[PDB]
């Protein structure tokens, strides 16, 4: 068994166009107050450019999983990169005040490519890396996707200033679309020449066993939904992860409403939320591995997410910009840090069911609640101001905190692991 040096280039290029794809998800929500003026549509319409990523994930998750297991890894990788590249070039045809529907068509194509990209953070690690490197390679793939959102907040406010003149505003928007289109096309060329179908030699003994080994999705889903403990965890995971999508999409609307101007600083808050959360994941992941106390750390971290919202909700309008950075950073520190806790707690409760099925339900719950929260909070912000909009998320996250408390620590995988040893 020998491993090839190509394994690091495979993840590096994958994390690059996953970074580009995540940029296009939030490139409209970071400058939401600017795209409203360019196209003349309301804030609800601009939020759809960030929510169509959520909608397409729900029905396309299962077929893409079947496609990935059928046509291999390279075919899905080419499809995901080409659609991401194709969607970026379609957007450049929408550089007119009246061509908003062209933007939606272009973003929907990028929305389809999101499913083909988020489907294999882990599968790339299995095929290309040995048993020791599976854990770190899977995190690097997720590392790029999260870092794309951080770039997606900081950059658009710098490239696109708040100009009343549509004709001059279109040039600045054109620069942003050209760079993303150029990067996506440049990475699409890279995907063609590096991503191969499989490494020349197996990377680990398990992969050799996996290749030699070579029920249905609906059969598994029935059994997981019989686990009451997992059903509660699915709901609580959706409330937390969905609150992240809702707040990220509406972050520009909340910040600009209380601080006129300062579009560039609103992007910095978005970067602060993501970057702090990226540090939250590694701390929570390391702590959970060492302590192995899945139930207690899930409740403590989930409560801190509620505490983050409470301090964020009331300190946003105090009139101080720096305190928003601290409150949003702490708020984002625990929201993204809860994601590794939810995944590990779900696999622990659903043993020996496949991790892909368990993680798929959590992701679907995240997108379903992301659409509900974004729609409901948007109407509340429009009609009742931004404070009831954030309070609405605080109330729901409080409901999730109680539901998590009733989850029984049925850590059956830990029981199974010690059973094999004895």
* 1-214 matches 215-411+413-417 in fold: yes
Long-range contacts of residues 256-262, Cβ cutoff 8 Å, at least 24 apart = 256/33, 257/381, 257/386, 258/316, 258/317, 258/319, 258/386, 259/321, 261/162, 262/321
Q: What's the CA gap between 71 and 277, in Å, rounded?
A: 35
Query: Whose CA is closest to 245, among 369, 333, 156, 329?
Result: 369
Contact at 8 Å (CB) between 74 and 197?
yes
What is the C-alpha R_g of the chain? Answer: 21
Give the Å distances, CA to CA, from 77 to 70, 196, 293, 363. Answer: 13, 10, 36, 20
What dihedral do alpha carbons 282, 283, 289, 290 form, nearest 10°? Answer: 140
What crossing angle do the helices spanning 355-384 and 228-249 adopt, rounded to 10°?
Answer: 40
CATH 3.90.1150.10 applies to domain 215-411+413-417: no
In the chain, where the domains are located: 1-214, 215-411+413-417
- Report cis status (omega within 30 of 0) of the bond before 243: no
Whether 121 contacts 145, CB under 8 Å: yes
Q: Quick one: tokens of 61?
A: 């998750």
Cα(35)–Cα(20) distance, integer angstroms:
20
In degrees to the nearest 10, what's the CA dihedral of 259, 263, 264, 266? 60
Chain length of the chain: 422
Half-sphere exposure (Cβ direction) of 186: Cα atoms closer than 13 Å = 8
Method: cryo-EM
Report how far residue 356's alpha carbon sits from residue 143's, in angstroms, rounded to the nearest whole number: 19
Got the DSSP string for 308-327? HHHHHHHHGGGS-HHHHHHH
Residue 220 vs residues 19, 57, 157: alpha-carbon distances, Å: 32, 20, 45
Q: By the 8 A CB rule, do 362 and 346 touch? A: yes
- Binding-site members are 1-7, 21, 25, 114, 118, 245, 367
DSSP state of 136: H
Burial 89-98 (b: 16+ CB within 10 A, else e): bbbeebbeee
Round to whole Å and give the CA distance between 396 and 302. 12
Q: What number of other Cβ atoms are within 10 A of residue 206's Cβ?
A: 14
Residue reference for tokens 């509340």:
380
Structure tokens at 409: 């620590």
The candidate with the shortest Cα–Cα distance to 60, out of 74, 75, 80, is 80
Q: Report yes or no: 173 and 38 within 8 Å, Cβ to Cβ.
A: yes
Breaks (C-N over 2.5 A) in the chain follow: 214
Least Cα distance to 375 among 52, 39, 153 occurs for 52
CB-based burial label for 31 (10 Å; 0-12, 13-18, 19+): buried
Q: The tokens of 102 are what?
A: 């062209």
**CA–CA separation, 127 vs 108, rounded Å?**
30
At what resolution in Å was this solved? 3.1
Q: Which residue ranges are tagged as binding site for heme b?
A: 1-7
Q: What is the C-alpha separation between 201 and 203, in angstroms, rounded?
A: 6
Residues 6+ apart with CB under 8 A from 4: 128, 199, 200, 201
Q: Which residue has the tokens 């899905």?
A: 76
> Domain 1-214: which topology?
Growth Hormone; Chain: A; (1.20.1250)
The helix, strand and coil proportions of the chain, stated in percent and rounded to the nearest 5, come to 85, 0, 15
Say if CB 89 and CB 181 are below 8 A apart. Answer: yes
- Is 198 in a helix, a strand, or coil? coil
**DSSP string spanning 323-352?**
HHHHHHHHHHHHHHHHHHHHHHHHHHHTTT
| Annotated binding-site residue numbers for choline | 21, 25, 114, 118, 245, 367
Helix-helix angle 6-26:43-91, to 10 degrees: 140
Q: Which residues contact 176 (CB under 8 A, 6 or more apart)?
A: 27, 155, 156, 159, 160
What is the distance between the alpha carbons of residues 39 and 103, in angstroms, rounded to a whole number?
A: 10
- The contacts found for 394-402 with CB under 8 angstroms, 24 or more apart, are 394/306, 394/309, 394/310, 394/313, 396/239, 396/243, 397/239, 397/240, 397/243, 397/305, 397/306, 397/309, 398/306, 399/239, 400/235, 400/236, 400/239, 400/240, 400/302, 401/299, 401/302, 401/303, 401/306
| 23, two tokens | 């940029």
Number of other residues whose CB lies within 10 A of the CB of residue 374:
25
d(CA 300, CA 295): 9
Quickly list DSSP for 227-296.
Answer: -HHHHHHHHHHHHHHHHHHHHHHTHHHHHHHHSSS-HHHHHHHHHHHHHHHHHHHHHHHHHHHHH--HHH
């Amino acid at each position: 068994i020998k491993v090839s040096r190509r394994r690091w280039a495979v993840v590096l290029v994958f994390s690059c166009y996953s970074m580009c794809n995540s940029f296009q998800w939030i490139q409209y929500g970071s400058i939401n107050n600017i795209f409203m003026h360019f196209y003349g549509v309301s804030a609800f319409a601009i939020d759809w450019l960030s929510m169509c990523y959520m909608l397409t994930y729900i029905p396309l998750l299962l077929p893409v999983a079947w496609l990935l297991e059928k046509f291999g890894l390279r075919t899905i990788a080419l499809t995901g990169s080409a659609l991401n590249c194709l969607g970026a070039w379609v957007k450049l045809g929408s550089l007119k005040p009246h061509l908003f529907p062209v933007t939606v068509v272009g973003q929907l194509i990028c929305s389809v490519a999101q499913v083909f990209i988020l489907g294999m953070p882990s599968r790339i690690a299995s095929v290309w890396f040995g048993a020791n490197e599976v854990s770190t390679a899977c995190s690097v793939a997720v590392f790029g996707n999260q870092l794309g959102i951080a770039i997606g907040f900081l950059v658009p406010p710098v490239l696109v200033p708040n100009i009343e003149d549509r004709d001059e505003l279109a040039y600045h928007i054109s620069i942003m679309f050209y760079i993303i289109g150029g990067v996506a096309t440049l990475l699409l060329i890279l995907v063609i020449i590096v991503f191969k179908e499989k490494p020349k030699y197996p990377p680990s003994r398990a992969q050799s066993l996996s290749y030699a080994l070579t029920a249905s999705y609906l059969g598994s889903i029935a059994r997981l939904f019989k686990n009451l403990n997992f059903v509660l965890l699915v709901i609580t995971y959706g409330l937390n992860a969905g609150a992240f999508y809702a707040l990220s999409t509406l972050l520009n609307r909340m910040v600009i409403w209380h601080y006129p101007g300062e579009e560039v600083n609103a992007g910095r808050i978005g970067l602060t939320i993501v970057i702090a959360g990226m540090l939250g994941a590694v701390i929570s992941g390391i702590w959970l591995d060492r302590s192995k106390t899945y139930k207690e750390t899930t409740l403590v971290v989930y409560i801190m997410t509620l505490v983050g919202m409470v301090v964020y909700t009331f300190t946003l309008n105090l009139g101080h910009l720096w305190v928003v950075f601290i409150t949003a950073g702490t708020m984002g520190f625990f929201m993204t840090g809860y994601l590794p806790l939810g995944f590990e707690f779900a696999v622990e409760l659903t043993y020996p069911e496949s991790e892909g099925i368990s993680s798929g339900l959590l992701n679907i719950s995240a997108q379903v609640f992301g659409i509900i929260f974004t729609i409901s909070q948007g109407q509340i912000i429009d009609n009742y101001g931004t404070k009831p909009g954030n309070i609405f998320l605080c109330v729901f996250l409080t409901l999730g905190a109680a539901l998590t408390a009733f989850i029984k620590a049925d850590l059956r995988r830990q029981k199974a692991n010690k059973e094999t040893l004895e």
